[PDB]
RNA sequence: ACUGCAGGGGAGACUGGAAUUCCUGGUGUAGCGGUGGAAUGCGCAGAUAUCAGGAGGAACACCGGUGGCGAAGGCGGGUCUCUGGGCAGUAACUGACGCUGAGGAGCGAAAGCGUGGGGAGCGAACAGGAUUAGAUACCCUGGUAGUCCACGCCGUAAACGGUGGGUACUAGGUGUGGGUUUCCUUCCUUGGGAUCCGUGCCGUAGCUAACGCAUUAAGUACCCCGCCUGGGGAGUACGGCC
C-alpha cells in the first residue's frame, strides 16, 4: 500500500494526476487486489474518484 | 453532542469535589442533558427509531442511577430531584 | 444518388436477429439490409450465415452509394458479431477500427423475470 | 390541518373542517372591502343561465392585487393572513414601505412577518413577483399572467402551482395544473411558490345544509324528469336514459373547445 | 464556525477578468454573517470530461471559506440560483 | 471522564450520470419482435435501425469481498445538517450501583389496508397465442392493482446459526477487520513478536444416536427466563382481546 508506505500524501478529489492510476482504461475503479491498497485507502480512493467524476474532472465512462 | 466544555459546565455545577465525574449526581445530570437534547432532536425526525432506542437506553440507565442514589441517601436523592426535575 | 466516401457501420447482433446499418459520420443512414431482409425467417435469422449475408447486402448497397471505408460499432450478445465484420471486410470495404458500444446500465431499470423453462 | 367532528349527530358523522390555524386577525381590512350581492345564477335578462346557484351566506369582496406592477423595488412586510370567502386560498395583507395596504394570495410558507419583494431584482423566494425572464427554469410559480400587464389568471386555487419548463426565444413553456403544456410570453409575471391551503380538498361537508350555506342549490338528475323537461326523461320504472347521454339541451358529450380557436398556436400538448 | 471548501464551475462565455469581482458579492454575504474567506484560487478554463449544460468548457474556482453552516447553505443556495454557475460542490476540509 | 480510531448505523434536505420508455425533428426502407419450433403482436398511415433535442420515474455498474455497521428486521451514487452505538489507550472519578426478567412497552422483511400524490420498467388478476388428450399452468405478446413517495394501520416469515441472556475455565494451527505496543527499529518491514476486541476455516481433549460441535461449544460449571410430553383432529372450534 503506497499510502501506508509513505504517509502525509493526501488523497483528494482534485488531484487528478494521482487519480489517473487506480482507474482502468475505460474509467472504472481498479480492484483492491490489483493495486494493493488497504481497505481504508481503497475507500478513500473510491470516494475521491466518485467525487471527481461528479464534479466532471474525470469521465463517468471513457468508452 | 456535549462537547468537552459543555460537559464541564454541568460537571462544575453538579459534581462533588472539583474532579468528580462518576458520582450518581454528575452522571444523572449528564444523562438528563443528553436526554433533553436528543428529545429536541426527536421532535423533528419523528422516524429516527435507531436514535430513539439510544434515548431509551439512556433513560433506563438514568433510572437505575436514580434508584441507587435513593437507596443510598434519601437526602441527596431529594436535593437532586429538586435541582433537576421528576414526573 | 449520394456520395459519402467515409461512413460508419453499426452491427446490432441479438440472440434472435442481426441488423447492419451504414450511416454517414453525422448519423444519417445510407443502407440497412438485415438478416430478415435477406431471404430468411424464424430462428434461422440468428445463424452466422444469415449475418454475413446481411453484411454483404448492406456493404454492396452502400458501395453503390459511394462508401469506401467504414468504422464499425458492434453491440449485442449475438453470434454473427464477428462474421458480419469479416463479411464487411471481404465484400470490398476496409474497416480499420472496431468499437464496442453495448449499453451498460449503472444498475438502473429492473429486468424481466428469469424464465423457468 | 383538517379537524374531524365527533359523530354526535347524524349530520356530523363524517364531516370535517379547517383548523384555521394559519389565520390571524379574523376581521378584514376596512379600506380594501367592496360589497357583493348574490345573483342566483341570473343574467341581465333576469333568467337562470347557470343552474344550482342561490342562497348562501352574505359575502364582502376583498380587493386582491393581481397586477403587482407599480411597486417594483419597494419591499413589503406580511402583516396578517386572513380568511377569504371568495376563494379557496387564504390571503395575506402586505404593508409596503411607502405605506400602502394590499392583499395578495398567500403562498405556501409565507408566515406573518416575512418580507416580500417585487421586480427583476428580487430573490427566488415564496411570495416574490418577477417577470418570467428572471425566474430560473424548474421553479414552482403561481398567479401567472397570460398577457403582459393583464393580471394573474393561472394557478390561483388552493394548492396549485405551475412548473416552468423553459424559455426558448421570447416564450416560456409552462405545465399548468391540468397538466397541459402551454406557451406564454416571457414578459409575463408570476409569483414564486405554490398556493397555500393545499389540504382544503380533503374537507368532508357533512350535510346538505352546509352546502346550502356555500350557495349550491339541489341538483335533479335528468333521468327522473319527464320527456318534455330533459332528453333522459320518461319511462315506466327507472331507466338509464333511452339514449346516449346528453346535456339538458340535447348536446352530446365530446370535446367542446373551438377547433380553430386563435390560441392553438400557444398550446403544445393538450391535457390527458 | 467550520472550515468548508466550495469549488465552482462557471460559464465559459464569461471572460476570466470579471470572474474575480463577480463572486465578491457572494463573499460579502459571508463576511456580513461573520465568516472568513482565505483563498479564492482560480483555475481558469479547462475542458470538462463531459458536456455540462451544452458547454464543453468551464472556469474552475475554489472558494475555501470558513463560517457557520447556515451561512454556507445560504451561499450555495445563492450560487446554484445564479445563472453563470454550472456546478457547485460544498465539502468540509475537516472530518 | 479524557484522548484517539473504524464504520453501506439512522433521519432530513439538495444534487449526479449511465440505461430503459415516451415525445419532437432529421436520415431511411420493409420488415421487426419472439421461440425448442411458432403464432398472437407492432409496421408499411413510415416501424425496427441511426443521429440531435426534451420529459419523467425508478435503481445506483466499476469500488464490492468470504469484507464492514446494526438488538433483530436490515443498511452501499454524492454533498451538507442533525443523531445513536462500538473498540482501544489512560487510570482521572463513583464505589456492587450487577445479571435475568412473568406480565407490559417499543421496534419489527414482504405481501396487504386507509387518505393523498406519482407511475419509466417490472408485473398478481385479466386477455390473446402456443404446447397439450385437456393446460384455469410452465413458454410468448400485452396488461390493472402493486412495486415509489407522505402520513397512519397491520405485527406475520425457513423473522435461521432451525442454537435465549450473563459469567468463568479447558491444546493448538492458519486467514482476515479495528486498535495499542516494546524488542528485532529498518531486519523500510510497514515485516516479526506481545496484548485487547471482532469475523472465517481446520483441528486435541471432551460431548453426541449419528451427522457433527469443538475458546464464536452442541465441552466443564453457576444464575434467571421461554418452551416440550406419541401422530392426527389442530394452532382448528367455542369464549375473549386487538
Ligand atoms: Mg330586463
Ligand atoms: Mg351544477
Ligand atoms: Mg341529484
Ligand atoms: Mg316522474
Ligand atoms: Mg314546465
Ligand atoms: Mg325531446
Ligand atoms: Mg328517455
Ligand atoms: Mg321512469
Ligand atoms: Mg324496468
Ligand atoms: Mg346509468
Ligand atoms: Mg423519507
Ligand atoms: Mg411514457
Ligand atoms: Mg422517426
Ligand atoms: Mg428510434
Ligand atoms: Mg474512594
Ligand atoms: Mg432485561
Ligand atoms: Mg415477556
Ligand atoms: Mg409500528
Ligand atoms: Mg410494503
Ligand atoms: Mg397503498
Ligand atoms: Mg384490495
Ligand atoms: Mg392511491
Ligand atoms: Mg412484461
Ligand atoms: Mg407474463
Ligand atoms: Mg389464456
Ligand atoms: Mg412464528
Ligand atoms: Mg433474515
Ligand atoms: Mg422457532
Ligand atoms: Mg450467550
Ligand atoms: Mg449460554
Ligand atoms: Mg483471529
Ligand atoms: Mg439420544
Ligand atoms: Mg469444525
Ligand atoms: Mg445435544
Ligand atoms: Mg386462529
Ligand atoms: Mg373467535
Ligand atoms: Zn493503506
Amino acid at each position: 500500500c503506497v499510502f501506508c508506505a509513505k504517509k502525509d500524501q493526501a488523497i483528494d478529489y482534485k488531484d487528478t494526476a494521482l487519480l489517473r492510476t487506480y482507474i482502468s482504461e475505460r474509467g472504472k475503479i481498479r480492484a483492491r487486489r490489483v493495486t494493493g491498497n488497504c481497505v481504508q485507502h481503497q475507500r478513500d480512493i473510491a470516494l475521491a474518484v466518485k467525487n471527481a467524476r461528479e464534479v466532471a474532472l474525470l469521465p463517468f465512462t471513457s468508452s | 453532542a456535549l462537547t468537552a466544555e459543555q460537559k464541564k459546565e454541568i460537571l462544575r455545577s453538579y459534581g462533588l469535589h472539583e474532579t468528580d465525574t462518576g458520582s450518581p449526581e454528575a452522571q444523572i445530570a449528564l444523562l438528563t442533558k443528553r436526554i433533553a437534547d436528543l428529545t429536541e432532536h426527536l421532535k423533528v425526525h419523528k422516524h429516527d427509531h435507531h436514535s430513539r432506542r439510544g434515548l431509551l437506553l439512556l433513560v433506563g440507565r438514568r433510572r437505575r442511577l436514580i434508584k441507587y442514589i435513593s437507596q443510598i441517601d434519601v437526602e441527596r436523592y431529594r436535593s437532586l430531584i429538586e435541582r433537576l426535575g421528576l414526573r | 444518388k449520394k456520395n459519402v466516401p467515409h461512413g460508419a457501420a453499426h452491427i446490432k447482433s441479438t440472440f434472435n436477429n442481426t441488423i447492419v446499418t451504414i450511416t454517414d459520420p453525422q448519423g444519417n443512414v445510407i443502407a440497412w439490409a438485415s438478416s430478415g431482409h435477406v431471404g430468411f425467417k424464424g430462428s434461422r435469422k440468428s445463424t452466422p450465415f444469415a449475418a454475413q449475408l446481411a453484411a454483404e447486402n448492406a456493404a454492396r448497397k452502400a458501395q453503390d452509394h459511394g462508401v469506401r471505408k467504414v468504422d464499425v460499432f458492434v453491440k449485442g450478445p449475438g453470434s454473427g458479431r464477428e462474421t458480419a465484420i469479416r463479411s464487411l471486410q471481404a465484400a470490398g470495404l476496409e474497416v480499420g477500427a472496431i468499437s464496442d458500444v453495448t449499453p451498460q446500465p449503472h444498475n438502473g431499470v429492473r429486468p424481466p423475470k428469469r424464465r423457468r423453462v | 390541518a383538517i379537524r374531524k367532528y365527533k359523530p354526535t349527530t347524524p349530520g356530523r358523522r363524517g364531516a370535517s373542517v379547517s383548523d384555521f390555524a394559519e389565520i390571524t386577525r379574523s376581521t378584514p381590512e376596512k379600506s380594501l372591502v367592496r360589497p357583493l350581492h348574490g345573483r342566483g345564477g341570473r343574467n341581465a335578462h333576469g333568467r337562470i343561465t347557470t343552474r344550482h346557484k342561490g342562497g348562501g351566506h352574505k359575502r364582502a369582496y376583498r380587493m386582491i392585487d393581481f397586477r403587482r406592477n407599480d411597486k417594483d423595488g419597494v419591499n413589503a412586510k406580511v402583516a396578517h393572513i386572513e380568511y377569504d370567502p371568495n376563494r379557496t386560498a387564504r390571503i395575506a395583507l402586505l404593508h409596503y414601505l411607502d405605506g400602502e395596504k394590499r392583499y395578495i394570495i398567500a403562498p405556501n410558507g409565507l408566515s406573518q412577518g416575512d418580507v416580500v419583494e417585487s421586480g427583476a431584482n428580487a430573490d427566488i423566494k415564496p411570495g416574490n413577483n418577477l417577470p418570467l425572464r428572471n425566474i430560473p427554469a424548474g421553479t414552482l410559480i403561481h398567479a401567472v399572467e397570460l398577457r403582459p400587464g393583464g393580471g394573474a389568471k393561472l394557478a390561483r386555487s388552493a394548492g396549485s402551482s405551475i412548473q416552468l419548463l423553459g424559455k426558448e426565444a421570447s416564450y416560456a413553456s409552462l405545465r399548468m395544473p391540468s397538466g397541459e403544456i402551454r406557451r406564454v410570453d416571457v414578459r409575463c409575471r408570476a409569483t414564486v411558490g405554490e398556493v397555500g391551503n393545499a389540504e382544503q380538498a380533503n374537507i368532508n361537508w357533512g350535510k346538505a345544509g352546509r352546502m346550502r350555506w356555500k350557495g349550491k342549490r339541489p341538483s335533479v338528475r335528468g333521468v327522473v324528469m319527464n320527456p318534455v323537461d330533459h332528453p333522459h326523461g320518461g319511462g315506466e320504472g327507472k331507466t338509464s336514459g333511452g339514449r346516449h347521454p346528453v346535456s339538458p339541451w340535447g348536446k352530446p358529450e365530446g370535446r367542446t373547445r373551438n377547433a380553430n380557436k386563435s390560441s392553438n398556436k400557444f398550446i403544445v400538448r393538450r391535457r390527458r | 464556525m467550520r472550515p468548508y471548501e466550495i469549488m465552482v464551475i462557471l460559464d465559459p462565455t464569461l471572460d476570466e477578468r470579471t470572474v474575480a469581482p463577480s463572486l465578491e458579492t457572494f463573499l460579502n454575504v459571508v463576511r456580513k454573517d461573520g465568516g472568513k474567506v482565505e483563498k479564492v484560487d482560480i483555475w481558469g478554463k479547462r475542458r470538462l470530461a463531459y458536456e455540462i449544460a451544452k458547454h464543453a468548457e468551464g472556469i474552475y474556482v475554489v472558494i475555501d471559506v470558513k463560517a457557520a453552516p447556515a451561512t454556507v447553505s445560504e451561499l450555495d443556495r445563492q450560487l446554484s440560483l445564479n445563472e453563470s454557475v454550472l456546478r457547485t460542490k460544498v465539502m468540509r476540509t475537516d472530518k
Side-chain angles (χ1 to χ4, degrees):
Chain A
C1 192
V2 174
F3 316 101
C4 288
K6 61 182 296 294
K7 317 158 166 69
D8 56 316
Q9 188 274 331
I11 297 169
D12 174 85
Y13 74 110
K14 296 183 290 294
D15 177 326
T16 317
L18 168 83
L19 300 184
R20 291 329 298 251
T21 175
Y22 312 117
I23 49 164
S24 69
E25 293 82 3
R26 312 209 47 221
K28 292 181 181 180
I29 313 171
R30 289 193 204 283
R32 176 174 167 255
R33 72 184 81 74
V34 303
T35 80
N37 297 2
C38 61
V39 193
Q40 312 183 23
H41 289 120
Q42 175 82 17
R43 183 180 63 83
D44 295 330
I45 288 298
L47 262 190
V49 161
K50 285 171 182 174
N51 280 306
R53 291 169 166 165
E54 178 142 346
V55 66
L57 298 164
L58 286 173
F60 275 101
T61 187
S62 44
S63 181
Chain B
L2 278 75
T3 67
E5 69 275 16
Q6 216 192 324
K7 292 189 196 171
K8 297 296 289 183
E9 293 84 4
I10 297 169
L11 287 180
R12 284 185 326 250
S13 296
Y14 285 86
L16 301 184
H17 56 292
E18 293 83 4
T19 52
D20 180 323
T21 55
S23 62
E25 298 92 323
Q27 290 195 65
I28 284 159
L30 282 163
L31 286 179
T32 304
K33 184 70 147 87
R34 292 199 58 191
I35 281 168
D37 207 16
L38 193 52
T39 284
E40 292 84 4
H41 164 83
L42 283 170
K43 293 182 184 293
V44 191
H45 313 301
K46 277 74 69 177
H47 306 312
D48 199 5
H49 307 295
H50 295 234
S51 314
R52 203 178 314 271
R53 182 175 181 267
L55 180 69
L56 264 173
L57 304 194
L58 298 183
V59 159
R61 173 158 299 110
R62 185 180 71 181
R63 166 154 54 255
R64 282 85 170 93
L65 279 178
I66 288 192
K67 185 183 287 185
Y68 166 63
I69 190 167
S70 177
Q71 296 294 321
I72 191 166
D73 189 358
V74 65
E75 294 294 328
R76 286 167 71 191
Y77 167 60
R78 293 180 181 177
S79 56
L80 193 58
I81 300 299
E82 294 294 328
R83 287 185 74 189
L84 277 164
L86 172 66
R87 281 295 302 278
Chain C
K1 33 182 177 300
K2 281 191 253 223
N3 175 49
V4 183
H6 202 261
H10 309 259
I11 300 141
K12 182 166 169 289
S13 188
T14 63
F15 278 129
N16 283 338
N17 205 14
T18 178
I19 310 180
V20 185
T21 183
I22 307 305
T23 72
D24 66 352
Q26 294 82 17
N28 302 319
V29 173
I30 310 305
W32 59 265
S34 74
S35 180
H37 172 251
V38 184
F40 277 126
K41 186 180 289 293
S43 68
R44 320 201 155 111
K45 302 198 296 180
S46 43
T47 59
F49 175 62
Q52 63 84 30
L53 267 192
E56 293 179 353
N57 200 292
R60 68 181 65 252
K61 219 188 298 178
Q63 270 167 213
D64 284 11
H65 272 286
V67 187
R68 319 264 74 71
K69 180 188 286 289
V70 291
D71 276 294
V72 169
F73 312 104
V74 297
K75 70 193 192 197
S79 43
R81 192 181 180 182
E82 69 275 16
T83 311
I85 314 164
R86 179 169 337 116
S87 160
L88 270 176
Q89 275 198 67
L93 283 172
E94 172 52 276
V95 297
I98 297 89
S99 179
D100 186 11
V101 285
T102 308
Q104 174 189 339
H106 292 175
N107 189 359
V109 167
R110 166 156 188 146
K113 64 198 188 170
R114 188 269 299 164
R115 310 180 61 224
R116 291 193 303 282
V117 76
Chain D
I2 293 306
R3 167 196 161 205
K4 294 181 176 67
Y5 292 132
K6 278 200 181 317
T8 45
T9 53
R12 290 165 77 95
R13 188 166 284 277
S16 63
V17 71
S18 290
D19 67 18
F20 304 117
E22 67 286 337
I23 282 179
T24 62
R25 196 181 82 145
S26 67
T27 60
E29 172 62 35
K30 184 168 183 286
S31 75
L32 298 170
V33 177
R34 311 281 145 91
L36 285 163
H37 65 96
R39 289 182 173 87
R42 267 81 168 169
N43 80 332
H45 295 157
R47 289 203 187 173
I48 292 169
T49 54
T50 303
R51 306 185 301 159
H52 313 158
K53 307 265 191 181
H57 210 287
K58 190 183 193 182
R59 280 169 193 182
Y61 178 76
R62 290 123 174 95
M63 266 162 69
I64 306 296
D65 180 30
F66 284 117
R67 309 268 173 173
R68 292 187 76 179
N69 272 303
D70 49 353
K71 302 302 187 54
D72 291 331
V74 176
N75 286 12
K77 171 205 299 296
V78 178
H80 294 290
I81 312 296
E82 310 182 5
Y83 182 84
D84 197 6
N86 306 307
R87 60 204 78 250
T88 43
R90 311 276 172 256
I91 62 185
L93 176 71
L94 300 189
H95 291 175
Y96 284 89
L97 294 177
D98 56 46
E100 165 147 7
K101 320 285 192 69
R102 292 258 182 91
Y103 289 164
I104 66 156
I105 295 170
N108 189 28
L110 197 83
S111 296
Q112 156 189 55
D114 292 331
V115 71
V116 160
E117 324 181 350
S118 310
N121 290 307
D123 199 18
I124 309 299
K125 299 298 293 295
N128 288 3
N129 198 260
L130 288 83
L132 286 182
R133 184 178 296 113
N134 311 127
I135 310 183
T139 306
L140 293 193
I141 53 185
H142 69 271
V144 185
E145 291 187 326
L146 276 181
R147 308 181 80 190
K153 291 164 172 288
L154 317 168
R156 321 203 316 197
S157 292
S160 292
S161 79
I162 284 175
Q163 207 266 315
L164 177 56
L165 286 187
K167 302 173 286 295
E168 55 254 29
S170 172
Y171 284 140
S173 279
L174 316 180
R175 173 178 288 127
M176 293 183 286
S178 66
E180 85 166 7
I181 314 290
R182 187 180 170 87
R183 201 172 71 245
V184 290
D185 199 306
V186 295
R187 266 178 295 149
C188 291
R189 300 182 73 105
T191 307
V192 161
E194 175 198 330
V195 190
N197 206 31
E199 69 275 16
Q200 70 99 28
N202 306 326
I203 285 168
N204 185 309
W205 323 97
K207 50 179 200 165
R210 207 160 164 211
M211 288 317 289
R212 305 300 307 276
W213 302 340
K214 304 162 70 53
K216 291 174 70 175
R217 268 171 47 71
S219 167
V220 187
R221 303 170 280 110
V223 67
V224 285
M225 297 180 177
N226 284 313
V228 73
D229 300 319
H230 197 286
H232 288 175
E236 283 315 276
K238 67 178 62 177
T239 65
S240 294
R243 46 190 281 178
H244 306 96
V246 288
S247 81
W249 305 267
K251 298 290 181 67
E253 310 201 340
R255 317 276 195 83
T256 49
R257 193 180 197 270
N258 196 346
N260 60 48
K261 208 178 164 186
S262 175
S263 80
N264 290 337
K265 73 200 45 173
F266 303 118
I267 290 182
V268 186
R269 207 161 74 231
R270 184 195 177 266
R271 85 200 151 89
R272 160 191 171 167
Chain E
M1 301 192 316
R2 311 177 185 182
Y4 295 94
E5 175 169 344
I6 300 148
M7 181 220 84
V8 178
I9 301 168
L10 293 172
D11 199 357
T13 62
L14 294 174
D15 45 32
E16 304 194 333
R17 292 179 180 176
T18 78
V19 64
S22 176
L23 61 83
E24 289 319 317
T25 61
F26 306 98
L27 298 204
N28 296 115
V29 67
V30 167
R31 266 151 189 153
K32 300 295 187 291
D33 293 330
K36 294 180 176 67
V37 172
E38 293 82 3
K39 197 142 154 53
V40 193
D41 189 358
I42 303 182
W43 291 4
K45 293 182 183 293
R46 293 182 184 271
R47 184 176 177 87
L48 314 169
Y50 53 90
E51 182 272 331
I52 295 174
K54 294 180 176 67
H55 304 308
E57 294 293 328
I59 294 92
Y60 282 82
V61 182
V62 181
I63 301 299
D64 186 74
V65 67
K66 187 269 183 182
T71 291
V72 169
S73 88
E74 163 76 10
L75 187 153
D76 63 358
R77 177 190 77 88
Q78 294 220 12
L79 286 169
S80 66
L81 204 50
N82 186 8
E83 182 65 26
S84 301
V85 186
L86 298 184
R87 286 275 166 81
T88 300
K89 172 66 65 185
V90 168
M91 293 177 71
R92 282 182 58 170
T93 78
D94 68 25
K95 300 289 94 176

